């Protein structure tokens, strides 16, 4: 899937930009990003999960 | 009520004033990175702009940091009025590297505007780096990246803003810029070489390695 490949590239870019600063994302952040990359839920539902995440 | 650099940070703290009210650096970093990751995902689904310039760079900072900083999208040379009634400004900024003798001094005062306008001139003259031979694209991408490193236009979030700006610039020029193969160490090494030695070749080598047409 072209769409899922674009989502995976966005997620890898989000991880890289923090890793290049020496920042590891919170486990909850990574879990929500992974679900989006895999097509488990929409961009809107991804946004809801991020805003509702307990850190 | 004179604007000052001190008003960017909480009283008696080294932590930047933020919308989360978090003074603990670890917890602040976690939440700021969480929101920046959310913004990144939404940004990569957004249609590319017709023009790349310093206004677009400020928009990207606004997108990445709107939920973290009241001053998201605002540059450090311009007095910024916080909701708390204080006014912050930081015309003078420097960064020390633990392996380097002398600090890197960023653009002073209104030289921040000059740095932003510098990239605008390059991007107008070179048509957003589109329709160029590969060698020219790599050279000007490196010139832009090194120029933004010196300008350091924002109080914080420069690196993150600069990288997505350059990914999007590359995408509009039919290139995929892959920062995932670049380590924190390699990024720092090439940036110090351009800043202190005036040597752009390590940065150009890095961009050549990570640019895929």
């Amino acid at each position: 899937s072209e769409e899922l490949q674009k989502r995976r590239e966005a997620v890898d870019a989000a991880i890289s930009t923090h890793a290049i600063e020496g920042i590891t994302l919170h486990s909850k952040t990574l879990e929500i990003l992974e679900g989006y990359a895999k097509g488990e839920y929409s961009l809107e539902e991804f946004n809801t999960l991020m805003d509702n995440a307990t850190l | 009520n004179l604007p000052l650099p001190i008003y960017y940070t909480y009283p008696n703290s080294l932590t930047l004033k933020n919308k989360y009210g978090i003074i603990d650096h670890k917890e602040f970093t976690d939440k700021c990175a969480h929101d920046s990751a959310k913004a990144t995902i939404n940004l990569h689904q957004e249609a590319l702009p017709k023009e790349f310039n310093s206004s677009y760079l400020k928009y990207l900072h606004k997108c990445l940091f709107e939920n973290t900083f009241e001053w998201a999208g605002c540059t450090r040379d311009i007095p910024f009025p916080f909701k708390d009634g204080t006014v912050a400004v930081m015309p003078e900024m420097m960064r020390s590297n633990w392996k380097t003798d002398q600090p890197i001094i960023f653009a002073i005062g209104n030289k921040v505007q000059d740095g932003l306008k510098n990239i605008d001139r390059i991007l107008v003259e070179k048509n957003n780096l589109q329709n160029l031979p590969r060698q020219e694209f790599i050279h000007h991408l490196a010139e832009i990246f090194a120029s933004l490193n010196y300008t350091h236009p924002f109080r914080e979030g420069n690196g993150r803003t600069q990288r997505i700006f350059c990914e999007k610039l590359a995408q509009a020029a039919n290139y995929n810029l892959d920062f995932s193969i670049v380590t924190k160490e390699r990024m720092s090494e090439v940036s110090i070489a351009a800043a202190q030695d005036g040597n752009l070749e390590p940065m150009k080598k890095l961009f050549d390695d990570i640019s895929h047409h």
Side-chain angles (χ1 to χ4, degrees):
Chain A
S1 170
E2 192 181 59
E3 206 190 309
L4 294 180
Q5 189 57 55
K6 284 180 178 185
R7 291 190 178 197
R8 177 59 71 190
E9 286 171 3
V11 166
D12 290 341
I15 294 162
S16 170
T17 200
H18 292 92
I20 203 160
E21 301 251 307
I23 294 162
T24 294
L25 298 180
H26 190 283
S27 59
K28 189 57 71 174
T29 307
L30 295 166
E31 176 191 351
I32 298 161
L33 286 162
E34 186 66 15
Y36 174 74
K38 289 163 139 165
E40 296 171 12
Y41 37 80
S42 65
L43 179 59
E44 179 170 16
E45 296 286 356
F46 163 80
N47 289 338
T48 297
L49 285 168
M50 294 292 285
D51 291 352
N52 294 347
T54 295
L55 307 174
Chain B
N1 180 45
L2 197 59
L4 295 167
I6 196 56
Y7 302 123
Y8 262 120
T9 62
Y10 289 113
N12 292 322
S13 179
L14 296 164
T15 304
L16 283 171
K17 290 180 180 173
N18 61 83
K19 297 188 170 191
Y20 315 125
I22 302 171
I23 210 161
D24 185 84
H25 194 264
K26 159 85 211 303
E27 294 177 323
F28 170 72
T29 302
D30 280 351
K31 193 153 190 183
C32 173
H34 178 86
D35 269 314
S36 288
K38 181 193 175 192
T40 294
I41 296 322
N42 283 277
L43 282 165
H44 287 309
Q45 284 296 134
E46 199 167 78
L48 294 159
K50 181 59 214 71
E51 303 294 348
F52 289 84
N53 52 42
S54 61
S55 287
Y56 189 64
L57 186 79
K58 296 181 205 174
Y59 167 77
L60 291 173
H61 188 272
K62 187 177 186 286
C63 292
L64 290 171
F65 295 105
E66 171 61 30
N67 291 326
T68 305
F69 300 124
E70 283 179 44
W71 47 268
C74 309
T75 61
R76 64 174 167 85
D77 56 316
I78 301 171
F80 179 79
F82 276 100
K83 283 170 185 186
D84 65 23
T86 69
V87 186
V89 72
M90 198 159 188
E92 296 165 35
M93 278 193 83
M94 66 176 119
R95 171 162 288 155
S96 294
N97 177 274
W98 79 275
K99 290 184 275 183
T100 76
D101 215 315
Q102 289 299 305
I104 290 163
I105 319 308
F106 299 126
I108 295 161
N110 63 42
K111 286 186 173 59
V112 166
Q113 296 307 128
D114 302 349
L116 294 176
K117 296 310 298 164
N118 180 53
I119 74 154
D120 295 347
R121 298 283 65 77
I122 299 161
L123 294 164
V124 168
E125 292 160 24
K126 304 303 283 197
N127 181 36
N128 302 301
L129 312 185
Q130 292 160 21
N131 314 319
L132 295 182
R134 192 166 191 242
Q135 288 191 106
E136 281 181 40
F137 169 86
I138 297 298
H139 177 85
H140 294 293
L141 184 63
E143 202 192 315
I144 292 163
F145 201 90
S147 184
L148 287 171
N149 277 353
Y150 171 69
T151 303
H152 198 86
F154 308 104
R155 176 60 183 80
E156 187 155 283
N158 294 284
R160 284 153 272 175
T161 306
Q162 199 169 323
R163 293 187 290 275
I164 192 166
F165 180 79
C166 291
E167 284 170 329
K168 288 185 168 296
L169 183 64
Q171 280 167 192
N174 302 301
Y175 284 95
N176 191 77
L177 198 63
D178 193 5
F179 286 110
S180 83
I181 62 159
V182 186
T183 61
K184 180 192 200 290
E185 298 83 9
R186 182 143 163 76
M187 186 48 80
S188 176
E189 279 164 35
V190 303
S191 298
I192 294 154
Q196 302 218 305
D197 305 321
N199 181 16
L200 211 65
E201 292 316 305
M203 194 175 280
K204 288 166 67 180
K205 171 88 174 74
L206 184 143
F207 284 119
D208 185 58
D209 287 346
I210 72 166
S211 293
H212 309 282
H213 196 90

